[PDB]
CHARMM-style PDB file with segment names, atoms N, HN, CA, C and O in Angstrom:
ATOM      1  N   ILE     1       0.825  -1.202   0.000  1.00  0.00      PROA
ATOM      2  CA  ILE     1       0.000   0.000   0.000  1.00  0.00      PROA
ATOM      3  C   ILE     1       0.863   1.257   0.000  1.00  0.00      PROA
ATOM      4  O   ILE     1       0.765   2.086  -0.905  1.00  0.00      PROA
ATOM      5  N   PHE     2       1.705   1.391   1.017  1.00  0.00      PROA
ATOM      6  HN  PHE     2       1.784   0.718   1.752  1.00  0.00      PROA
ATOM      7  CA  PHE     2       2.588   2.548   1.134  1.00  0.00      PROA
ATOM      8  C   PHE     2       3.408   2.737  -0.139  1.00  0.00      PROA
ATOM      9  O   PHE     2       3.561   3.856  -0.629  1.00  0.00      PROA
ATOM     10  N   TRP     3       3.931   1.636  -0.666  1.00  0.00      PROA
ATOM     11  HN  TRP     3       3.807   0.727  -0.268  1.00  0.00      PROA
ATOM     12  CA  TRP     3       4.736   1.680  -1.883  1.00  0.00      PROA
ATOM     13  C   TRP     3       3.927   2.229  -3.051  1.00  0.00      PROA
ATOM     14  O   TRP     3       4.411   3.069  -3.811  1.00  0.00      PROA
ATOM     15  N   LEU     4       2.696   1.751  -3.188  1.00  0.00      PROA
ATOM     16  HN  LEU     4       2.303   1.070  -2.571  1.00  0.00      PROA
ATOM     17  CA  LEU     4       1.818   2.196  -4.267  1.00  0.00      PROA
ATOM     18  C   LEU     4       1.433   3.661  -4.086  1.00  0.00      PROA
ATOM     19  O   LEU     4       1.425   4.433  -5.045  1.00  0.00      PROA
ATOM     20  N   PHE     5       1.113   4.036  -2.852  1.00  0.00      PROA
ATOM     21  HN  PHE     5       1.119   3.409  -2.072  1.00  0.00      PROA
ATOM     22  CA  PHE     5       0.728   5.407  -2.545  1.00  0.00      PROA
ATOM     23  C   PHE     5       1.883   6.369  -2.808  1.00  0.00      PROA
ATOM     24  O   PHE     5       1.685   7.461  -3.341  1.00  0.00      PROA
ATOM     25  N   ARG     6       3.088   5.954  -2.430  1.00  0.00      PROA
ATOM     26  HN  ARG     6       3.249   5.067  -1.996  1.00  0.00      PROA
ATOM     27  CA  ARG     6       4.275   6.777  -2.623  1.00  0.00      PROA
ATOM     28  C   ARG     6       4.605   6.917  -4.105  1.00  0.00      PROA
ATOM     29  O   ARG     6       4.975   7.996  -4.569  1.00  0.00      PROA
ATOM     30  N   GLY     7       4.469   5.819  -4.844  1.00  0.00      PROA
ATOM     31  HN  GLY     7       4.168   4.942  -4.467  1.00  0.00      PROA
ATOM     32  CA  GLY     7       4.757   5.837  -6.264  1.00  0.00      PROA
ATOM     33  C   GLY     7       3.865   6.798  -7.025  1.00  0.00      PROA
ATOM     34  O   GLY     7       4.311   7.460  -7.963  1.00  0.00      PROA
ATOM     35  N   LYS     8       2.601   6.877  -6.621  1.00  0.00      PROA
ATOM     36  HN  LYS     8       2.239   6.340  -5.859  1.00  0.00      PROA
ATOM     37  CA  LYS     8       1.644   7.762  -7.269  1.00  0.00      PROA
ATOM     38  C   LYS     8       2.031   9.224  -7.068  1.00  0.00      PROA
ATOM     39  O   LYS     8       2.041  10.009  -8.016  1.00  0.00      PROA
ATOM     40  N   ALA     9       2.349   9.582  -5.827  1.00  0.00      PROA
ATOM     41  HN  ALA     9       2.341   8.944  -5.056  1.00  0.00      PROA
ATOM     42  CA  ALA     9       2.739  10.947  -5.502  1.00  0.00      PROA
ATOM     43  C   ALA     9       4.070  11.308  -6.155  1.00  0.00      PROA
ATOM     44  O   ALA     9       4.271  12.442  -6.589  1.00  0.00      PROA
ATOM     45  N   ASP    10       4.974  10.335  -6.219  1.00  0.00      PROA
ATOM     46  HN  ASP    10       4.810   9.414  -5.866  1.00  0.00      PROA
ATOM     47  CA  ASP    10       6.284  10.550  -6.820  1.00  0.00      PROA
ATOM     48  C   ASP    10       6.152  11.114  -8.231  1.00  0.00      PROA
ATOM     49  O   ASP    10       6.935  11.971  -8.643  1.00  0.00      PROA
ATOM     50  N   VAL    11       5.156  10.628  -8.966  1.00  0.00      PROA
ATOM     51  HN  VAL    11       4.521   9.932  -8.632  1.00  0.00      PROA
ATOM     52  CA  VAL    11       4.919  11.085 -10.331  1.00  0.00      PROA
ATOM     53  C   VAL    11       4.826  12.605 -10.393  1.00  0.00      PROA
ATOM     54  O   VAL    11       5.286  13.224 -11.353  1.00  0.00      PROA
ATOM     55  N   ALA    12       4.230  13.199  -9.365  1.00  0.00      PROA
ATOM     56  HN  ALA    12       3.856  12.696  -8.586  1.00  0.00      PROA
ATOM     57  CA  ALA    12       4.079  14.648  -9.303  1.00  0.00      PROA
ATOM     58  C   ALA    12       5.436  15.339  -9.262  1.00  0.00      PROA
ATOM     59  O   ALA    12       6.429  14.750  -8.835  1.00  0.00      PROA
ATOM     60  N   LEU    13       5.472  16.590  -9.709  1.00  0.00      PROA
ATOM     61  HN  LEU    13       4.665  17.069 -10.056  1.00  0.00      PROA
ATOM     62  CA  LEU    13       6.709  17.362  -9.726  1.00  0.00      PROA
ATOM     63  C   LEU    13       6.880  18.144  -8.426  1.00  0.00      PROA
ATOM     64  OT1 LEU    13       7.871  18.855  -8.259  1.00  0.00      PROA
TER      65      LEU     13
END
């Protein structure tokens, strides 16, 4: 979960 949530936000600049 955390990994997926972090990956999504990471996309942002």
